Amino acid sequence: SAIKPDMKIKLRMEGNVNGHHFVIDGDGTGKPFEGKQSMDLEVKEGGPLPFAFDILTTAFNRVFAKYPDNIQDYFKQSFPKGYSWERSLTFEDGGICNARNDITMEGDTFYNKVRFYGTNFPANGPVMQKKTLKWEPATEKMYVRDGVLTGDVETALLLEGNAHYRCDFRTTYKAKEKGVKLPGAHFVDHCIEILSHDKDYNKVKLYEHAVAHSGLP
């Protein structure tokens, strides 16, 4: 396999949320076969961010997902040429985000060209007031729609004061090489956590664990 057990991650995100521009660099490592990755993020422009860092974290690669033998692993089969994804995030208070990542590989390193655009967050809402605590663990439903691998998530951020803030995600995934075979319908469970950060989330250590499964025992 082109994909080694230990891989490096280099990332640049450029984005705009409610008109605030930012550039964030990431450096990390992961274990594709164990579905684990960790990365150090550093805000390079636009800091301190005037919105909840949590809305960005799912944009900071389903190659870091433990896939069993009985499910086609589209993501690992996409290398070395790579793949990209496009995602819409719809929040319950009208906030909308569009994100994309183009993922390439050179030697032992995944390179990520990430774009993140968010609009329509109410100024008095939990995102612009920085009242988010974390993403709850979530399940991504994977299926092919009209020849395109699609992942749906229905989830929520936990807020201060025992409240939840609902978000629906739809991601479409496309391999760069024609003829990478599409998988059957399946689930990917993930957990995403900010392990540590400094005062205004200028530096953030991010961790994610993901496991693909078929639903039953």
Residue numbers in the entry: 2 to 61, 65 to 221
From the reporting publication:
A synthetic rsFP referred to as rsEospa, derived from EosFP family, displays the same spectroscopic behavior as the GFP-like rsFP Dronpa at pH 8.4 and involves the photoconversion between nonfluorescent neutral and fluorescent anionic chromophore states. RsEospa shows cis–trans isomerization at both acidic and neutral pH with similar atomic coordinate modification but distinctively different visible excitation requirements and spectral features.
At pH 5.5 we see a striking difference in the photoswitching behavior. However, at pH 5.5 we observe that the OFF state is identified as the cationic chromophore with additional protonation of the imidazolinone nitrogen which is concurrent with a newly formed hydrogen bond with the Glu212 carboxylate side chain. Excitation of the neutral-cis with 400 nm light causes a bleach in the 389 nm peak and a + 7 nm redshift assigned to the formation of a cationic-trans chromophore. Under the illuminated condition, we observe difference spectra peaks at 1713 and 1692 cm–1 at pH 5.5 and at 1710 and 1690 cm–1 at p2H 5.5 which we assign to the C=O stretch of the cationic-trans chromophore. The Glu212 carboxyl oxygen to imidazolinone-ring nitrogen (N4) distance is reduced from 3.76 Å at pH 8.4 to 2.54 Å at pH 5.5. We interpret this rearrangement as the formation of a H-bond which is made favorable by protonation of the chromophore. At acidic pH, this isomerization occurs reversibly with a change in protonation state to a trans-cation chromophore state, a new class of reaction not previously observed in rsFPs.
